[PDB]
Design a protein around this ligand. Structure first.
Ligand SMILES: C=CC1=C(C)/C(=C/c2[nH]c(/C=C3N=C(/C=C4\NC(=O)C(C)=C4C=C)C(C)=C\3CCC(=O)O)c(CCC(=O)O)c2C)NC1=O
Length: 210
């Protein structure tokens, strides 16, 4: 199992409509069975274009990367999460409302802020004033679970109060173009699963509305 199960459960507790509509990849790779496992899922449901759910695990790594893309028409942000356990004393937890409009600073008043000193992501470009990043230990991940449920409640609120119905995937063009520029997914998958698979995972699954 995953250290992440309590995040994963809270996610689909808040959004019970997100049913798997395509299992994009179940892949084995890494060291030889294969010791690296990818589950790539796409989920649909009321008020969403998609939720794309990547989950990679090997003996050392445990990575859950999931973006909720809502239907367009209501200027709504995505909700993105990168739950990354690299070693057994190194985890990084990332979650934010990620707005499709470039250069623009989105926020939700009441929520942790941020500043925003965090190095790998740029506040105000597809990351909000309330971007949540922490570094911690595997055994202490659930300390931030309630904060997580607070972001989910707020995001649920804004979906429910706007109820978008548009399907204009080009709204997310700039966003997914930007996110494809992030490292290291491309190379991590390259090594672990091969070039064809890394290319497809990134361009056809993770960030496919470029
Ligand atoms: C989805 C698959 C996925 C994989 C396979 C992955 C692997 C991964 N991400 C890392 C760091 C990191 N990865 C990210 C973020 C990302 N990096 C990305 O490739 C993407 C798409 C994001 C975010 C949406 C960040 C912010 C770090 C910083 C680590 C640090 O604190 O130094 C590292 C440590 C080594 C390094 O920084 O080069 C690995 C192995 N991260 C992932 O999200």
């Amino acid at each position: 199992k995953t250290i992440w199960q309590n995040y994963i459960d809270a996610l689909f507790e808040t959004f019970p409509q997100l049913e798997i509509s395509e299992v994009w990849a179940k892949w084995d790779g890494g060291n030889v069975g294969g010791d690296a496992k990818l589950t790539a899922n796409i989920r649909t449901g009321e008020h969403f274009l998609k939720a794309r759910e990547a989950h990679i695990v090997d003996p050392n790594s445990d990575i859950y990367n999931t973006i909720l893309y809502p239907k367009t028409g209501a200027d709504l942000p995505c909700f993105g999460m990168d739950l990354m356990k690299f070693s057994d004393k190194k985890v990084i937890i990332v979650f934010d409302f990620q707005h499709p409009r470039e250069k623009y600073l989105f926020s939700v008043d009441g929520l942790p802020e941020d500043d925003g000193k965090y190095r790998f992501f740029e506040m105000g470009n597809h990351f909000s004033k309330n971007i949540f990043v922490r570094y911690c230990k595997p055994d202490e991940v659930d300390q931030y679970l309630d904060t997580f449920k607070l972001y989910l409640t707020k995001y649920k609120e804004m979906i429910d109060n706007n109820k978008p119905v548009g399907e204009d995937t080009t709204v997310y063009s700039d966003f997914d173009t930007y996110m494809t520029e992030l490292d290291p997914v491309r190379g991590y998958m390259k090594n672990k699963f091969g070039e064809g698979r890394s290319e497809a995972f990134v361009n056809d699954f993770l960030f496919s509305y470029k």
